[PDB]
Amino acid sequence: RTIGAELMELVRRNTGLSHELCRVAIGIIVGHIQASVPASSPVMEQVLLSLVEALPSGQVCHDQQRLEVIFADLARRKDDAQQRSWALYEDEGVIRCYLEELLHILTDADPEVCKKMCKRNEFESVLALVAYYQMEHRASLRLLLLKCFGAMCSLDAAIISTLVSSVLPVELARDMQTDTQDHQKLCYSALILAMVFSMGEAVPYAHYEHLGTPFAQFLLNIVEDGLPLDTTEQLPDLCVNLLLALNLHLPAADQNVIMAALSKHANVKIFSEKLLLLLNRGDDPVRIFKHEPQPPHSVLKFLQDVFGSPATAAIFYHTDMMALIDITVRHIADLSPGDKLRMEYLSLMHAIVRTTPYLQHRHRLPDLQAILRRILNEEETSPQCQMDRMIVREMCKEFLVLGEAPS
Amino acid sequence: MAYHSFLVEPISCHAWNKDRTQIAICPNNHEVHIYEKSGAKWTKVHELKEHNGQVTGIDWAPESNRIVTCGTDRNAYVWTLKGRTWKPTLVILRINRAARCVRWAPNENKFAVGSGSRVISICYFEQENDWWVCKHIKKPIRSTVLSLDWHPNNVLLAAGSCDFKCRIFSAYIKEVEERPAPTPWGSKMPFGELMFESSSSCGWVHGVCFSASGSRVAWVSHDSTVCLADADKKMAVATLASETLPLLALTFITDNSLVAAGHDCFPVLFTYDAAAGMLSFGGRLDVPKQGLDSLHKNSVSQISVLSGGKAKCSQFCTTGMDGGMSIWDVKSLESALKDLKIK
Amino acid sequence: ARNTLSSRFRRVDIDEFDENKFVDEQEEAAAAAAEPGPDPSEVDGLLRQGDMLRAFHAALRNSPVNTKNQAVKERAQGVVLKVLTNFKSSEIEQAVQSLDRNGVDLLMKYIYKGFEKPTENSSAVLLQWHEKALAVGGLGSIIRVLTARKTV
Amino acid sequence: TATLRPYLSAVRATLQAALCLENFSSQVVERHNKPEVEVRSSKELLLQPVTISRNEKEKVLIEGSINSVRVSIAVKQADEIEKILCHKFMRFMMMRAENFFILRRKPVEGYDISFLITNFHTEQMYKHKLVDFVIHFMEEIDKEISEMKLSVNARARIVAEEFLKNF
């Protein structure tokens, strides 16, 4: 009745395997004794169904016990005011052992266990580590906490709302501007910051003291000039994915803190080069997790906001804008009706004509004119397809030369 | 519904003995490998190595136990089992290009080979020199011949060609048989007489089979148009254009129903009603398997009748480019498909 | 190495003057008088009033397949290709479903001929037609375009 | 200038229609085995050509046969810098045509690349995966050119800075 769940607990204990491979090992063993010994097939098929399709009453998982023991000590070591500010005993080897064990459980065990024990009592255990991180100064332990937060964001999205609304993104954004020597901590800090901002949820206003415009200039100076200690050159492609994610919850490009960074910078070229290599493929590097509701496309959200003002539009060199128009045009046509993105490329194109002198050089204007007349003459009746046509009319109405026949 | 993968490469041709105890495949090479059915296993017993080229047609005479081969090397060889080994016996086809098909006769006194030389070679035995001399039928034909099947009279011959036609010829050899009895196809049946020539001129004729009665012949084409001519109804043709990839071989399981297979990688069924005068699609036979969804993972090139003859067949065999040979049981498909009906 | 004898005999090609070359057949009865094809006034008068579905069948009823002449074929193509381009995208499934099998195959023949020489927007329509006729006729419809020895 | 989903849906269906192939020995030479679409000695074995096209420039040509298929393709080249990068890319793809077994070392006239698929590829290789390579090619080629146009423009800046910086 409950065999398939009581075996997985036995196997994970005495082998250390993950949840997935625990089910594989049993499905293979059973599925092979069933075939070699047909006399046992009725018993085996019940056993397989228990896997495909709960635990006994008092029996509690091993991974659930450990998370009661780990979250309880780390919160006890947080509430130990003496040992934190006035150290006497050694703590780096014990804490490093509980945080390693935690990272192997969140990474391998069943997510629904690791979800409830983190969602328990209104995220009491998550929010402690977020404070212990603020309290701890040792980078050997700040690094393991980041690897643990990155595993908790993959489980649920309610945890992301808990972290982004907390003080974590303000300490990372403060440790990165200050402690630039540690390369791993600077590269993981920029990963977690992109995780928690991935969903587009808003944040307290107080975060913008350390996540505002001076933090963007710091990230642009790294994207453009790089660091000396960055030998492998991972950090520019992480400080790009982070800027794309900060700009997700930020509305009203005129009021945007990031765009004030671009318009203040002397010359951005490497940040613009990288935005187009992402647009050519239509890949959202911020979208690491498969959590609903799926937020918008981070790149187009950015470029829609770049071209929401003419001060930020002039960052693109001449050769790059023409490559941006060749791409946007190619996607508008290659995309099918009923897609969500087609109005984004259209709204993006509408933003280019306003804030740039597109009507003086008119690059790919004939190929564009033929595509908009098609989209208006499309007889589709979905609501989304009516939103596209609604944009095109506004685009042609504002600029008439986009409605004329190609010539 | 078996499936034994003899190899990974194609199987150009196959033939069964009388007992269906042994099978002679060509594993896409110059050799004929004879496998025997040991219980639920398949064991190779012989290998025939005389061809300078690839083999395209094999037939096994059931009574005499004499295998005949045809290959791209413009050769044929009649094999006789002397003791424990097969020994060949030479053939004189007199063709300037390669061969494509071969079929033993019912009475095992002749065979017919279809070639790319725009001919058909009616071969018979000559003990004066131990040769098998051949006579030609190349009056109307204009291109390669792909398939053949013998009438039960041991004289009349059907031939599917790449000229888009399925002609029917009279392979009467005076030296080895007396003049035949008449037939609804015609009385005047001397050597090399075009009795019936189809009308359609679109698509290559891949397969041809006579009916057990001898009064019905069907042919498959690359146009996805199965056909069937009835002599009782003044040689009228009934087509059934399919909505899938073409077929490459057919056979009469009964006097009314057929079974075809080809590039769709499974068999199907076709039903004929002489009252209405048309064909009808009897549905796919093999159930969709629980990308491809069948046993044959590539095309099928040859279909054969093991048990029950063409009069009423209980088991038929499929042989395909996927190095496989699948035996089918007809009644098992009747049961496993309650909708399925075999007329 | 190199040769120093006249090797010009290997240049002339004798295979051109051959007697075994293939010869396909044609309709003798059509060489004298060709099939008139869909008359423009018939279809057009049905297009003025907007009766597309009947101008549709009028164009597929007549088709000069047996004709050896190419102009009447070209005129016939421009007529039907003029008709398919004026359809309403929602009405196409309504029209394709009406046709029998032998009209779907003749349709797909004309479709694969419209792709040869396209106008500005002749092909975005024909790809929609191609989707419907394939949903009805399947791959076997296309095979009767490839195997067809007589063009539309 | 129509859409990309139906185009590849039409091409994919025509290809399954034309990869219905089988071996076939020659009837003009003694024991040759050639792809008849290339030699074109036997008219009866040559199916019709059929064309597909989003527009005037982009199109596909499937010349089928009993034992061969030829799939010529034309790619869109808006500007001159894209005509160059596509011309070179095919040359570097044709040079490795012994590794792309379904490839021609030169393209058909009027087209940018041409495939050739014999009856020995379907027997050995997976027929449904070969189609997926042609289709995967036709939708990635546009991305792999603009990624080079952007890479040429990025190089041209550094070559300018490394000269003007020294002033």
Side-chain angles (χ1 to χ4, degrees), chain D residues 77-103:
Chain D
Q77 291 154 12
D79 37 5
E80 300 297 289
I81 188 68
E82 282 182 9
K83 295 176 173 163
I84 292 168
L85 302 161
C86 184
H87 180 276
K88 298 183 179 288
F89 188 13
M90 302 305 156
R91 176 59 198 154
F92 283 93
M93 185 176 291
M94 290 167 186
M95 285 152 57
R96 296 186 71 182
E98 281 180 11
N99 318 60
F100 302 90
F101 295 94
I102 60 170
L103 199 55

PDB file of all heavy atoms in Angstrom, chain D residues 77-103:
ATOM      1  N   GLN D  77      19.203  37.859 -48.298  1.00  0.00           N
ATOM      2  CA  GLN D  77      20.422  38.654 -48.211  1.00  0.00           C
ATOM      3  C   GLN D  77      20.015  40.102 -48.447  1.00  0.00           C
ATOM      4  O   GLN D  77      19.969  40.570 -49.587  1.00  0.00           O
ATOM      5  CB  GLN D  77      21.445  38.180 -49.220  1.00  0.00           C
ATOM      6  CG  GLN D  77      22.015  36.821 -48.916  1.00  0.00           C
ATOM      7  CD  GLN D  77      22.519  36.101 -50.136  1.00  0.00           C
ATOM      8  OE1 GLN D  77      22.646  36.680 -51.212  1.00  0.00           O
ATOM      9  NE2 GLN D  77      22.804  34.821 -49.979  1.00  0.00           N
ATOM     10  N   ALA D  78      19.718  40.808 -47.360  1.00  0.00           N
ATOM     11  CA  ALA D  78      19.203  42.165 -47.473  1.00  0.00           C
ATOM     12  C   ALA D  78      20.262  43.118 -48.003  1.00  0.00           C
ATOM     13  O   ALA D  78      20.017  43.866 -48.957  1.00  0.00           O
ATOM     14  CB  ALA D  78      18.699  42.633 -46.117  1.00  0.00           C
ATOM     15  N   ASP D  79      21.442  43.101 -47.401  1.00  0.00           N
ATOM     16  CA  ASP D  79      22.526  44.021 -47.712  1.00  0.00           C
ATOM     17  C   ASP D  79      23.728  43.241 -48.229  1.00  0.00           C
ATOM     18  O   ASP D  79      23.743  42.010 -48.239  1.00  0.00           O
ATOM     19  CB  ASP D  79      22.889  44.871 -46.488  1.00  0.00           C
ATOM     20  CG  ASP D  79      22.802  44.106 -45.192  1.00  0.00           C
ATOM     21  OD1 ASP D  79      22.554  42.885 -45.242  1.00  0.00           O
ATOM     22  OD2 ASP D  79      22.970  44.726 -44.123  1.00  0.00           O
ATOM     23  N   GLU D  80      24.742  43.982 -48.671  1.00  0.00           N
ATOM     24  CA  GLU D  80      25.889  43.365 -49.322  1.00  0.00           C
ATOM     25  C   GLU D  80      26.743  42.601 -48.326  1.00  0.00           C
ATOM     26  O   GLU D  80      27.297  41.547 -48.654  1.00  0.00           O
ATOM     27  CB  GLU D  80      26.721  44.432 -50.018  1.00  0.00           C
ATOM     28  CG  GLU D  80      25.998  45.210 -51.092  1.00  0.00           C
ATOM     29  CD  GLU D  80      25.549  44.342 -52.248  1.00  0.00           C
ATOM     30  OE1 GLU D  80      26.416  43.896 -53.028  1.00  0.00           O
ATOM     31  OE2 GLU D  80      24.332  44.096 -52.373  1.00  0.00           O
ATOM     32  N   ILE D  81      26.864  43.118 -47.104  1.00  0.00           N
ATOM     33  CA  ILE D  81      27.658  42.452 -46.083  1.00  0.00           C
ATOM     34  C   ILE D  81      27.053  41.114 -45.681  1.00  0.00           C
ATOM     35  O   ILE D  81      27.759  40.268 -45.128  1.00  0.00           O
ATOM     36  CB  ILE D  81      27.845  43.402 -44.881  1.00  0.00           C
ATOM     37  CG1 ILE D  81      28.828  42.849 -43.848  1.00  0.00           C
ATOM     38  CG2 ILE D  81      26.535  43.700 -44.197  1.00  0.00           C
ATOM     39  CD1 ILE D  81      30.234  42.784 -44.306  1.00  0.00           C
ATOM     40  N   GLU D  82      25.771  40.885 -45.959  1.00  0.00           N
ATOM     41  CA  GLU D  82      25.168  39.579 -45.738  1.00  0.00           C
ATOM     42  C   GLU D  82      25.340  38.648 -46.926  1.00  0.00           C
ATOM     43  O   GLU D  82      25.367  37.427 -46.747  1.00  0.00           O
ATOM     44  CB  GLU D  82      23.683  39.726 -45.427  1.00  0.00           C
ATOM     45  CG  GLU D  82      23.396  40.163 -44.017  1.00  0.00           C
ATOM     46  CD  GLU D  82      21.918  40.255 -43.719  1.00  0.00           C
ATOM     47  OE1 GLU D  82      21.112  39.809 -44.559  1.00  0.00           O
ATOM     48  OE2 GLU D  82      21.564  40.776 -42.642  1.00  0.00           O
ATOM     49  N   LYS D  83      25.447  39.193 -48.136  1.00  0.00           N
ATOM     50  CA  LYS D  83      25.751  38.364 -49.295  1.00  0.00           C
ATOM     51  C   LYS D  83      27.132  37.748 -49.171  1.00  0.00           C
ATOM     52  O   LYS D  83      27.355  36.608 -49.592  1.00  0.00           O
ATOM     53  CB  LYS D  83      25.662  39.193 -50.570  1.00  0.00           C
ATOM     54  CG  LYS D  83      24.285  39.708 -50.883  1.00  0.00           C
ATOM     55  CD  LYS D  83      24.313  40.598 -52.098  1.00  0.00           C
ATOM     56  CE  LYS D  83      22.916  40.986 -52.542  1.00  0.00           C
ATOM     57  NZ  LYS D  83      22.941  42.163 -53.459  1.00  0.00           N
ATOM     58  N   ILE D  84      28.069  38.494 -48.594  1.00  0.00           N
ATOM     59  CA  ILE D  84      29.430  38.009 -48.429  1.00  0.00           C
ATOM     60  C   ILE D  84      29.469  36.880 -47.413  1.00  0.00           C
ATOM     61  O   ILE D  84      30.000  35.796 -47.677  1.00  0.00           O
ATOM     62  CB  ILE D  84      30.345  39.170 -48.014  1.00  0.00           C
ATOM     63  CG1 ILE D  84      30.479  40.163 -49.161  1.00  0.00           C
ATOM     64  CG2 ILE D  84      31.691  38.652 -47.578  1.00  0.00           C
ATOM     65  CD1 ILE D  84      31.105  41.454 -48.773  1.00  0.00           C
ATOM     66  N   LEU D  85      28.908  37.122 -46.233  1.00  0.00           N
ATOM     67  CA  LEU D  85      29.046  36.181 -45.134  1.00  0.00           C
ATOM     68  C   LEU D  85      28.306  34.884 -45.402  1.00  0.00           C
ATOM     69  O   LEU D  85      28.708  33.832 -44.897  1.00  0.00           O
ATOM     70  CB  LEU D  85      28.543  36.821 -43.851  1.00  0.00           C
ATOM     71  CG  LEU D  85      29.228  38.115 -43.438  1.00  0.00           C
ATOM     72  CD1 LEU D  85      28.372  38.840 -42.470  1.00  0.00           C
ATOM     73  CD2 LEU D  85      30.547  37.847 -42.823  1.00  0.00           C
ATOM     74  N   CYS D  86      27.227  34.933 -46.180  1.00  0.00           N
ATOM     75  CA  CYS D  86      26.560  33.699 -46.566  1.00  0.00           C
ATOM     76  C   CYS D  86      27.360  32.957 -47.622  1.00  0.00           C
ATOM     77  O   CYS D  86      27.422  31.726 -47.605  1.00  0.00           O
ATOM     78  CB  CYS D  86      25.153  33.990 -47.070  1.00  0.00           C
ATOM     79  SG  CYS D  86      24.214  32.520 -47.462  1.00  0.00           S
ATOM     80  N   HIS D  87      28.000  33.683 -48.537  1.00  0.00           N
ATOM     81  CA  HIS D  87      28.782  33.027 -49.576  1.00  0.00           C
ATOM     82  C   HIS D  87      29.963  32.282 -48.983  1.00  0.00           C
ATOM     83  O   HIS D  87      30.281  31.166 -49.408  1.00  0.00           O
ATOM     84  CB  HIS D  87      29.262  34.046 -50.599  1.00  0.00           C
ATOM     85  CG  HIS D  87      30.082  33.448 -51.695  1.00  0.00           C
ATOM     86  ND1 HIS D  87      31.434  33.217 -51.571  1.00  0.00           N
ATOM     87  CD2 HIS D  87      29.740  33.026 -52.933  1.00  0.00           C
ATOM     88  CE1 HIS D  87      31.890  32.679 -52.687  1.00  0.00           C
ATOM     89  NE2 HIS D  87      30.882  32.553 -53.530  1.00  0.00           N
ATOM     90  N   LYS D  88      30.630  32.884 -48.002  1.00  0.00           N
ATOM     91  CA  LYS D  88      31.756  32.220 -47.361  1.00  0.00           C
ATOM     92  C   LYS D  88      31.293  31.049 -46.515  1.00  0.00           C
ATOM     93  O   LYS D  88      31.931  29.992 -46.512  1.00  0.00           O
ATOM     94  CB  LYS D  88      32.526  33.214 -46.505  1.00  0.00           C
ATOM     95  CG  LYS D  88      33.127  34.349 -47.282  1.00  0.00           C
ATOM     96  CD  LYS D  88      33.936  35.258 -46.393  1.00  0.00           C
ATOM     97  CE  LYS D  88      34.550  36.387 -47.185  1.00  0.00           C
ATOM     98  NZ  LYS D  88      35.657  35.912 -48.043  1.00  0.00           N
ATOM     99  N   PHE D  89      30.180  31.214 -45.803  1.00  0.00           N
ATOM    100  CA  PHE D  89      29.717  30.189 -44.880  1.00  0.00           C
ATOM    101  C   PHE D  89      29.423  28.889 -45.609  1.00  0.00           C
ATOM    102  O   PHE D  89      29.757  27.805 -45.120  1.00  0.00           O
ATOM    103  CB  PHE D  89      28.479  30.705 -44.146  1.00  0.00           C
ATOM    104  CG  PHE D  89      27.982  29.830 -43.015  1.00  0.00           C
ATOM    105  CD1 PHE D  89      28.725  28.792 -42.486  1.00  0.00           C
ATOM    106  CD2 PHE D  89      26.744  30.078 -42.472  1.00  0.00           C
ATOM    107  CE1 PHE D  89      28.235  28.029 -41.467  1.00  0.00           C
ATOM    108  CE2 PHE D  89      26.260  29.312 -41.451  1.00  0.00           C
ATOM    109  CZ  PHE D  89      27.008  28.290 -40.950  1.00  0.00           C
ATOM    110  N   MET D  90      28.815  28.974 -46.786  1.00  0.00           N
ATOM    111  CA  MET D  90      28.550  27.768 -47.551  1.00  0.00           C
ATOM    112  C   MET D  90      29.830  27.144 -48.070  1.00  0.00           C
ATOM    113  O   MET D  90      29.939  25.916 -48.115  1.00  0.00           O
ATOM    114  CB  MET D  90      27.615  28.079 -48.706  1.00  0.00           C
ATOM    115  CG  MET D  90      26.310  28.679 -48.278  1.00  0.00           C
ATOM    116  SD  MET D  90      25.403  27.703 -47.076  1.00  0.00           S
ATOM    117  CE  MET D  90      24.412  28.968 -46.329  1.00  0.00           C
ATOM    118  N   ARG D  91      30.800  27.963 -48.469  1.00  0.00           N
ATOM    119  CA  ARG D  91      32.073  27.425 -48.917  1.00  0.00           C
ATOM    120  C   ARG D  91      32.736  26.620 -47.813  1.00  0.00           C
ATOM    121  O   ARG D  91      33.272  25.536 -48.064  1.00  0.00           O
ATOM    122  CB  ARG D  91      32.973  28.560 -49.393  1.00  0.00           C
ATOM    123  CG  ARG D  91      34.387  28.185 -49.809  1.00  0.00           C
ATOM    124  CD  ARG D  91      34.453  27.176 -50.937  1.00  0.00           C
ATOM    125  NE  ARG D  91      35.771  26.551 -51.002  1.00  0.00           N
ATOM    126  CZ  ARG D  91      36.031  25.348 -51.508  1.00  0.00           C
ATOM    127  NH1 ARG D  91      35.072  24.578 -52.012  1.00  0.00           N
ATOM    128  NH2 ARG D  91      37.275  24.905 -51.503  1.00  0.00           N
ATOM    129  N   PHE D  92      32.681  27.112 -46.583  1.00  0.00           N
ATOM    130  CA  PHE D  92      33.238  26.382 -45.457  1.00  0.00           C
ATOM    131  C   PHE D  92      32.356  25.236 -44.998  1.00  0.00           C
ATOM    132  O   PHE D  92      32.817  24.405 -44.209  1.00  0.00           O
ATOM    133  CB  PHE D  92      33.497  27.335 -44.302  1.00  0.00           C
ATOM    134  CG  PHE D  92      34.723  28.150 -44.482  1.00  0.00           C
ATOM    135  CD1 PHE D  92      34.662  29.391 -45.057  1.00  0.00           C
ATOM    136  CD2 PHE D  92      35.941  27.656 -44.109  1.00  0.00           C
ATOM    137  CE1 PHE D  92      35.785  30.127 -45.242  1.00  0.00           C
ATOM    138  CE2 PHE D  92      37.069  28.391 -44.293  1.00  0.00           C
ATOM    139  CZ  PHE D  92      36.990  29.630 -44.861  1.00  0.00           C
ATOM    140  N   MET D  93      31.117  25.169 -45.474  1.00  0.00           N
ATOM    141  CA  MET D  93      30.249  24.029 -45.236  1.00  0.00           C
ATOM    142  C   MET D  93      30.349  22.999 -46.346  1.00  0.00           C
ATOM    143  O   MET D  93      30.154  21.807 -46.094  1.00  0.00           O
ATOM    144  CB  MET D  93      28.806  24.508 -45.098  1.00  0.00           C
ATOM    145  CG  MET D  93      27.813  23.439 -44.731  1.00  0.00           C
ATOM    146  SD  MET D  93      26.159  24.076 -44.470  1.00  0.00           S
ATOM    147  CE  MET D  93      26.459  24.987 -42.978  1.00  0.00           C
ATOM    148  N   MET D  94      30.644  23.438 -47.564  1.00  0.00           N
ATOM    149  CA  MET D  94      30.866  22.523 -48.670  1.00  0.00           C
ATOM    150  C   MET D  94      32.220  21.843 -48.579  1.00  0.00           C
ATOM    151  O   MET D  94      32.362  20.690 -49.000  1.00  0.00           O
ATOM    152  CB  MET D  94      30.779  23.272 -49.987  1.00  0.00           C
ATOM    153  CG  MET D  94      29.412  23.741 -50.356  1.00  0.00           C
ATOM    154  SD  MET D  94      29.474  24.920 -51.698  1.00  0.00           S
ATOM    155  CE  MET D  94      27.757  25.365 -51.739  1.00  0.00           C
ATOM    156  N   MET D  95      33.221  22.546 -48.053  1.00  0.00           N
ATOM    157  CA  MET D  95      34.553  21.978 -47.915  1.00  0.00           C
ATOM    158  C   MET D  95      34.554  20.752 -47.018  1.00  0.00           C
ATOM    159  O   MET D  95      35.417  19.878 -47.165  1.00  0.00           O
ATOM    160  CB  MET D  95      35.498  23.038 -47.372  1.00  0.00           C
ATOM    161  CG  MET D  95      35.889  24.075 -48.397  1.00  0.00           C
ATOM    162  SD  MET D  95      36.305  25.682 -47.707  1.00  0.00           S
ATOM    163  CE  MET D  95      37.613  25.236 -46.585  1.00  0.00           C
ATOM    164  N   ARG D  96      33.606  20.670 -46.091  1.00  0.00           N
ATOM    165  CA  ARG D  96      33.428  19.516 -45.216  1.00  0.00           C
ATOM    166  C   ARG D  96      32.234  18.675 -45.635  1.00  0.00           C
ATOM    167  O   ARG D  96      31.513  18.132 -44.798  1.00  0.00           O
ATOM    168  CB  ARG D  96      33.282  19.979 -43.778  1.00  0.00           C
ATOM    169  CG  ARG D  96      34.508  20.652 -43.253  1.00  0.00           C
ATOM    170  CD  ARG D  96      34.379  20.968 -41.796  1.00  0.00           C
ATOM    171  NE  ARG D  96      34.426  19.767 -40.982  1.00  0.00           N
ATOM    172  CZ  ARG D  96      34.290  19.741 -39.664  1.00  0.00           C
ATOM    173  NH1 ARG D  96      34.090  20.858 -38.975  1.00  0.00           N
ATOM    174  NH2 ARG D  96      34.354  18.584 -39.031  1.00  0.00           N
ATOM    175  N   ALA D  97      32.010  18.546 -46.938  1.00  0.00           N
ATOM    176  CA  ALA D  97      30.860  17.813 -47.437  1.00  0.00           C
ATOM    177  C   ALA D  97      31.022  16.309 -47.329  1.00  0.00           C
ATOM    178  O   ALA D  97      30.031  15.586 -47.438  1.00  0.00           O
ATOM    179  CB  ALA D  97      30.594  18.184 -48.887  1.00  0.00           C
ATOM    180  N   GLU D  98      32.242  15.815 -47.145  1.00  0.00           N
ATOM    181  CA  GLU D  98      32.412  14.405 -46.830  1.00  0.00           C
ATOM    182  C   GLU D  98      31.918  14.069 -45.433  1.00  0.00           C
ATOM    183  O   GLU D  98      31.722  12.889 -45.128  1.00  0.00           O
ATOM    184  CB  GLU D  98      33.875  14.012 -46.979  1.00  0.00           C
ATOM    185  CG  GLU D  98      34.299  13.790 -48.408  1.00  0.00           C
ATOM    186  CD  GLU D  98      35.752  13.394 -48.540  1.00  0.00           C
ATOM    187  OE1 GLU D  98      36.387  13.097 -47.507  1.00  0.00           O
ATOM    188  OE2 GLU D  98      36.259  13.381 -49.678  1.00  0.00           O
ATOM    189  N   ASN D  99      31.708  15.076 -44.588  1.00  0.00           N
ATOM    190  CA  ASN D  99      31.173  14.910 -43.247  1.00  0.00           C
ATOM    191  C   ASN D  99      29.689  15.234 -43.166  1.00  0.00           C
ATOM    192  O   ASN D  99      28.973  14.628 -42.367  1.00  0.00           O
ATOM    193  CB  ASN D  99      31.955  15.791 -42.279  1.00  0.00           C
ATOM    194  CG  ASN D  99      33.440  15.761 -42.548  1.00  0.00           C
ATOM    195  OD1 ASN D  99      33.889  16.124 -43.631  1.00  0.00           O
ATOM    196  ND2 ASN D  99      34.211  15.333 -41.569  1.00  0.00           N
ATOM    197  N   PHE D 100      29.214  16.188 -43.967  1.00  0.00           N
ATOM    198  CA  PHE D 100      27.789  16.337 -44.246  1.00  0.00           C
ATOM    199  C   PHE D 100      27.485  15.430 -45.427  1.00  0.00           C
ATOM    200  O   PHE D 100      27.580  15.833 -46.583  1.00  0.00           O
ATOM    201  CB  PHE D 100      27.406  17.776 -44.572  1.00  0.00           C
ATOM    202  CG  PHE D 100      27.728  18.773 -43.513  1.00  0.00           C
ATOM    203  CD1 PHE D 100      28.940  19.412 -43.498  1.00  0.00           C
ATOM    204  CD2 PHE D 100      26.792  19.123 -42.576  1.00  0.00           C
ATOM    205  CE1 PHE D 100      29.226  20.346 -42.543  1.00  0.00           C
ATOM    206  CE2 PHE D 100      27.074  20.055 -41.622  1.00  0.00           C
ATOM    207  CZ  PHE D 100      28.292  20.668 -41.605  1.00  0.00           C
ATOM    208  N   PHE D 101      27.075  14.198 -45.139  1.00  0.00           N
ATOM    209  CA  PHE D 101      26.939  13.198 -46.190  1.00  0.00           C
ATOM    210  C   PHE D 101      25.869  13.543 -47.218  1.00  0.00           C
ATOM    211  O   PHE D 101      25.858  12.944 -48.298  1.00  0.00           O
ATOM    212  CB  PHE D 101      26.628  11.843 -45.569  1.00  0.00           C
ATOM    213  CG  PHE D 101      27.728  11.306 -44.722  1.00  0.00           C
ATOM    214  CD1 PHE D 101      27.740  11.525 -43.365  1.00  0.00           C
ATOM    215  CD2 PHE D 101      28.754  10.586 -45.284  1.00  0.00           C
ATOM    216  CE1 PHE D 101      28.752  11.038 -42.589  1.00  0.00           C
ATOM    217  CE2 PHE D 101      29.771  10.096 -44.509  1.00  0.00           C
ATOM    218  CZ  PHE D 101      29.769  10.322 -43.159  1.00  0.00           C
ATOM    219  N   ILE D 102      24.991  14.499 -46.923  1.00  0.00           N
ATOM    220  CA  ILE D 102      23.837  14.800 -47.760  1.00  0.00           C
ATOM    221  C   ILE D 102      24.050  16.097 -48.521  1.00  0.00           C
ATOM    222  O   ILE D 102      23.083  16.772 -48.888  1.00  0.00           O
ATOM    223  CB  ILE D 102      22.557  14.874 -46.908  1.00  0.00           C
ATOM    224  CG1 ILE D 102      22.659  15.962 -45.833  1.00  0.00           C
ATOM    225  CG2 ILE D 102      22.304  13.543 -46.267  1.00  0.00           C
ATOM    226  CD1 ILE D 102      21.382  16.243 -45.128  1.00  0.00           C
ATOM    227  N   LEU D 103      25.304  16.450 -48.765  1.00  0.00           N
ATOM    228  CA  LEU D 103      25.665  17.782 -49.212  1.00  0.00           C
ATOM    229  C   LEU D 103      26.365  17.729 -50.558  1.00  0.00           C
ATOM    230  O   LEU D 103      27.063  16.764 -50.880  1.00  0.00           O
ATOM    231  CB  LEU D 103      26.561  18.454 -48.186  1.00  0.00           C
ATOM    232  CG  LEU D 103      26.735  19.965 -48.188  1.00  0.00           C
ATOM    233  CD1 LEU D 103      25.448  20.672 -48.107  1.00  0.00           C
ATOM    234  CD2 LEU D 103      27.540  20.353 -47.011  1.00  0.00           C
TER     235      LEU D 103
END
